[PDB]
Write a protein that binds this ligand. Structure first.
Ligand SMILES: [K+]
Ligand SMILES: [K+]
Ligand SMILES: [K+]
Ligand SMILES: [K+]
Ligand SMILES: [K+]
Ligand SMILES: [K+]
Ligand SMILES: [K+]
Ligand SMILES: [K+]
Ligand SMILES: [K+]
Ligand SMILES: [K+]
Ligand SMILES: [K+]
Ligand SMILES: [K+]
Ligand SMILES: [K+]
Ligand SMILES: [K+]
Ligand SMILES: [K+]
Ligand SMILES: [K+]
Ligand SMILES: [K+]
Ligand SMILES: [K+]
Ligand SMILES: [K+]
Ligand SMILES: [K+]
Ligand SMILES: [K+]
Ligand SMILES: [K+]
Ligand SMILES: [K+]
Ligand SMILES: [Mg+2]
Ligand SMILES: [Mg+2]
Ligand SMILES: [Mg+2]
Ligand SMILES: [Mg+2]
Ligand SMILES: [Mg+2]
Ligand SMILES: [Mg+2]
Ligand SMILES: [Mg+2]
Ligand SMILES: [Mg+2]
Ligand SMILES: [Mg+2]
Ligand SMILES: [Mg+2]
Ligand SMILES: [Mg+2]
Ligand SMILES: [Mg+2]
Ligand SMILES: [Mg+2]
Ligand SMILES: [Mg+2]
Ligand SMILES: [Mg+2]
Ligand SMILES: [Mg+2]
Ligand SMILES: [Mg+2]
Ligand SMILES: [Mg+2]
Ligand SMILES: [Mg+2]
Ligand SMILES: [Mg+2]
Ligand SMILES: [Mg+2]
Ligand SMILES: [Mg+2]
Ligand SMILES: [Mg+2]
Ligand SMILES: [Mg+2]
Ligand SMILES: [Mg+2]
Ligand SMILES: [Mg+2]
Ligand SMILES: [Mg+2]
Ligand SMILES: [Mg+2]
Ligand SMILES: [Mg+2]
Ligand SMILES: [Mg+2]
Ligand SMILES: [Mg+2]
Ligand SMILES: [Mg+2]
Ligand SMILES: [Mg+2]
Ligand SMILES: [Mg+2]
Ligand SMILES: [Mg+2]
Ligand SMILES: [Mg+2]
Ligand SMILES: [Mg+2]
Ligand SMILES: [Mg+2]
Ligand SMILES: [Mg+2]
Ligand SMILES: [Mg+2]
Ligand SMILES: [Mg+2]
Ligand SMILES: [Mg+2]
Ligand SMILES: [Mg+2]
Ligand SMILES: [Mg+2]
Ligand SMILES: [Mg+2]
Ligand SMILES: [Mg+2]
Ligand SMILES: [Mg+2]
Ligand SMILES: [Mg+2]
Ligand SMILES: [Mg+2]
Ligand SMILES: [Mg+2]
Ligand SMILES: [Mg+2]
Ligand SMILES: [Mg+2]
Ligand SMILES: [Mg+2]
Ligand SMILES: [Mg+2]
Ligand SMILES: [Mg+2]
Ligand SMILES: [Mg+2]
Ligand SMILES: [Mg+2]
Ligand SMILES: [Mg+2]
Ligand SMILES: [Mg+2]
Ligand SMILES: [Zn+2]
Lengths: 37, 98, 52
RNA sequence: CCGGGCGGAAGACAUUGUCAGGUGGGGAGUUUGGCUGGGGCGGCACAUCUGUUAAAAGAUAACGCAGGUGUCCUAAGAUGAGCUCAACGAGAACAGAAAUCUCGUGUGGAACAAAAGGGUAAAAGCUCGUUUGAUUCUGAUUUCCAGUACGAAUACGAACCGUGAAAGCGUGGCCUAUCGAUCCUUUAGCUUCGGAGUUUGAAGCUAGAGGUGUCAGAAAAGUUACCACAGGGAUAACUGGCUUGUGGCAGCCAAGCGAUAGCGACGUUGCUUUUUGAUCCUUCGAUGUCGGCUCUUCCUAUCAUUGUGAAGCAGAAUUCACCAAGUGUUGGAUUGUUCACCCACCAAUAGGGAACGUGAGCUGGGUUUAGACCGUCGUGAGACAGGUUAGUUUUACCC
RNA sequence: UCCGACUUUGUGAA
RNA sequence: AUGUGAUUUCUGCCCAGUGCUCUGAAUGUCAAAGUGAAGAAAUUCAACCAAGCGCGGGUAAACGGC
RNA sequence: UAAGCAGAACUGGCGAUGCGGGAUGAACCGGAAGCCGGGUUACGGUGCCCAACUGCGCGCUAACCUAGAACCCACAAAGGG
RNA sequence: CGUUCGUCUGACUUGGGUAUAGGGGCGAAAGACUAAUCGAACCAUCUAGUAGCUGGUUCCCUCCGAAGUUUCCCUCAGGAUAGCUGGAGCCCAACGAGUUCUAUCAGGUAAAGCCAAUGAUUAGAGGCCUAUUCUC
RNA sequence: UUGAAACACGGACCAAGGAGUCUGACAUGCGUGCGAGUCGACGGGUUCUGAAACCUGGGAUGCGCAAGGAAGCUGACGAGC
């Protein structure tokens, strides 16, 4: 899902639903928060 | 467009084939019956696998409709149907001008 | 598309764990009457390395 | 010793099976208009009206010119009666350029929902009175035209009405645009459900509405530089051909400058095809697309050199012009360049053509495949005519 | 894949 | 399961958007089954109504903006 | 601006068509056609190429610019002597 | 293939055995590799797949002989439709005609006009008006 | 193809092979039989050359002889110019 583009970039949020199908569930799975506190 | 509510017009009913007084109301499409054959045929066709089986019209172009006036004879109590030209605003028995 | 790498690990083909030089499962002795009611003495004979 | 519970944990919850609702580019299938001085972007010339092009019957094209349409109106529809509009002249306290009244003139110079063109004066305009004919039933004809449909219109017939004393007029709007099939749904006014009935439901017949604006009417988003096929020279990107606006070069006049030494405004006539456009005739079962290196010929619109004429030519130098293409026109810094711009030498460092000469002669720095960065753009895949770096140059023995 | 109904699914107390 | 890419040094502001997430309000929407009321019945009507959606909060070393 | 450009009206033509002339050429001029003999013409020509006069007659031109020389047609201007 | 070049005690080189198979594998990631085949291998079959598109389409003479235009169509390199053409006839012989003449209707193009309406437009003259005036 | 000798494609040569066919449904035309009828097509009988041929089944098999109407249902009273 992160592949492609003319620059290396995800292009959509890397946080993904808990119920996403396999193959779609990549990145940060069911994250309550992101970033460094 | 403004139309009165007590038009005198020809009634074709066999009781009085002449000019009688009519009440004027606006026609509205009746409630769709779930038992209509085309509806029963459509529901049988939609069941199962295959997705949408009939064309679903999208490209609307008209911004008006032909208003249909129901005319009720005050002797027979039978009805007549009459469509008028396309109008954006319509009312029956509004306030007269002047 | 094609099957992603995260999906291919569940088939366990080349993603099975490397266990050829492991010394066996590490776990307590099976619970029995002596342990349930008293004590049993064992002696430590080796302290060994387990790969992985 | 006795208990016919292997020992725990959870427990009618979870789990299984079947239905129902949500989510679901993880995956499947499909689509992703047309016209078009290539295509795309733009526009709409796709239904549709007026004037003109249009060549005094009709018909008539272009992405021709100037505009318009998807509405609006119970009156702005019908009819009867009465009246006359724009504007001007002269008048009357407040009151003047425009407030209200009066007389005279007034062929429409006004108004008639709208664009434009027609048309209309005891009206088709304005004011008032009564009204709903903007009604029912089908036929016929006109315009479009295949002489099919639709829309729109006209002339009758058979009713029922309105208004007028009446003849008459009225089947919407003074005329020319103002709109929509089959299937399905819904509505308005007897037939069937086939063993017979009662009786809900359903299906029919006649006539409207719900809509297709790509308007004789599929239900529909992108990208490909990883790409494929069938074909196009019906169709772009080299060359060549026509043209010469633009580019370049040359003239005529003579107001001025300093009239015609040398120049020359305002005008005006040409030539050329080393510019760029315009076109799309040739080539898409392929004519190897930039530049330079090398090599030969050709032109003259002559830069130098030969011989001359002119000067606001004392000399020296320079400028203008003529006959003249015989001989020359170079070495370098930056840049892939072409073009450019500087250094230097020189008599001088003129301009061009030959498929923008020349890749089975080379080279491959640039353009322009596939890898990969950046900036901007895009949700994305990807794009960029922006920059950057790496990227196979085949064959001659035939005439 | 989540979610509800039925089925698996029984027994007794307030 | 992802992003960045040794060390040094530092990583500002932004939770409106799109995502992700929450133990939060509860009724705004809201399926099948089940419930009730009419009807001779087919059927119709009505209330109830799961998750999700909506409402509210968190989150940028999430996508991203400045 | 123009174009061997792009688009209309009437008619003809080429496309679908040979044959004679325009040296050559889809369309221009003549003319349309079975296989032949004889006669005569169209357009166009009569110095040679090339069949047919170096025919009869009047002027104009002299090009030391390649003088000039056949509709379409294969160009030339303003201005000068 | 030659010369030149990178690495060489490690994320090193290599044999055999074994595992993973096509919308699948495997990938220190180039859409790379998967038997000279990869942006979805190869084999047989469905299958003589479809094609408005390109190419070809075989004897002679004789007679007749076109169209590139109308309308509609997701129509624009295609169809149907009318027109143009052939064949088959059949019915008959006064009827006609891409022509003139006689008569009679209709037209707003060329030209002209502005010293006529609408519009544009130069100049004076005599008292805003009047009579002229150049040019559309 | 508007236009080909084309610097537009195919073609080195020769031999053999090589492309509007068969079937179904309609239609016009023509030919043959019968004619308000016609068809013997599936079966049966028979057949000493026979997968021919010959005979036979229709008082209702198919098309015709009668429309119109959604249907319920009705159904041509006999022409002049
Ligand atoms: K990406
Ligand atoms: K279905
Ligand atoms: K897959
Ligand atoms: K349970
Ligand atoms: K589902
Ligand atoms: K999906
Ligand atoms: K259409
Ligand atoms: K020029
Ligand atoms: K080509
Ligand atoms: K390299
Ligand atoms: K990150
Ligand atoms: K935000
Ligand atoms: K947010
Ligand atoms: K190394
Ligand atoms: K080595
Ligand atoms: K090994
Ligand atoms: K495959
Ligand atoms: K086509
Ligand atoms: K005139
Ligand atoms: K005038
Ligand atoms: K050839
Ligand atoms: K019969
Ligand atoms: K009927
Ligand atoms: Mg993906
Ligand atoms: Mg289902
Ligand atoms: Mg479901
Ligand atoms: Mg898909
Ligand atoms: Mg197109
Ligand atoms: Mg273009
Ligand atoms: Mg466009
Ligand atoms: Mg006219
Ligand atoms: Mg005419
Ligand atoms: Mg006319
Ligand atoms: Mg008008
Ligand atoms: Mg009318
Ligand atoms: Mg009356
Ligand atoms: Mg009126
Ligand atoms: Mg009228
Ligand atoms: Mg309808
Ligand atoms: Mg159409
Ligand atoms: Mg061409
Ligand atoms: Mg110029
Ligand atoms: Mg000048
Ligand atoms: Mg070629
Ligand atoms: Mg060549
Ligand atoms: Mg070649
Ligand atoms: Mg010279
Ligand atoms: Mg020279
Ligand atoms: Mg050149
Ligand atoms: Mg070249
Ligand atoms: Mg080469
Ligand atoms: Mg080269
Ligand atoms: Mg060469
Ligand atoms: Mg290169
Ligand atoms: Mg590249
Ligand atoms: Mg972005
Ligand atoms: Mg490079
Ligand atoms: Mg890391
Ligand atoms: Mg927030
Ligand atoms: Mg809820
Ligand atoms: Mg429910
Ligand atoms: Mg042809
Ligand atoms: Mg030809
Ligand atoms: Mg002869
Ligand atoms: Mg002589
Ligand atoms: Mg010639
Ligand atoms: Mg002269
Ligand atoms: Mg080597
Ligand atoms: Mg697998
Ligand atoms: Mg590897
Ligand atoms: Mg790539
Ligand atoms: Mg195969
Ligand atoms: Mg269509
Ligand atoms: Mg073709
Ligand atoms: Mg006129
Ligand atoms: Mg004129
Ligand atoms: Mg061509
Ligand atoms: Mg040929
Ligand atoms: Mg050629
Ligand atoms: Mg070809
Ligand atoms: Mg060949
Ligand atoms: Mg043969
Ligand atoms: Zn009545």
């Amino acid at each position: 899902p992160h592949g492609g583009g003319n620059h290396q970039h995800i292009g959509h949020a890397s946080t993904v639903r808990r119920d996403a199908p396999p193959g779609q569930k990549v990145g940060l799975i069911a994250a309550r928060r992101t970033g460094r506190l | 467009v403004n139309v009165p509510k007590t038009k005198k017009t020809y009634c074709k009913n066999k009781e009085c084939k002449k000019h009688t007084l009519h009440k004027v109301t606006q026609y509205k499409k009746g409630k769709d019956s779930l038992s209509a054959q085309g509806k029963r045929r459509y529901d049988r066709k939609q069941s199962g696998y295959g997705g949408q089986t009939k064309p679903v019209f999208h490209k609307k172009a008209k911004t008006t409709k032909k208003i249909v006036l129901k005319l009720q004879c005050q002797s027979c109590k039978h009805y007549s149907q009459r469509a008028i030209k396309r109008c954006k605003h319509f009312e029956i028995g509004g306030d007269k001008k002047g | 598309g094609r099957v992603i790498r995260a999906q291919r690990k569940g088939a366990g083909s080349v993603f099975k764990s490397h266990t050829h030089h492991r010394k066996g499962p590490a776990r307590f002795r099976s619970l029995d009457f002596g342990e349930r009611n008293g004590y049993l003495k064992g002696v430590v004979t080796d302290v060994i390395h387990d790969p992985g």
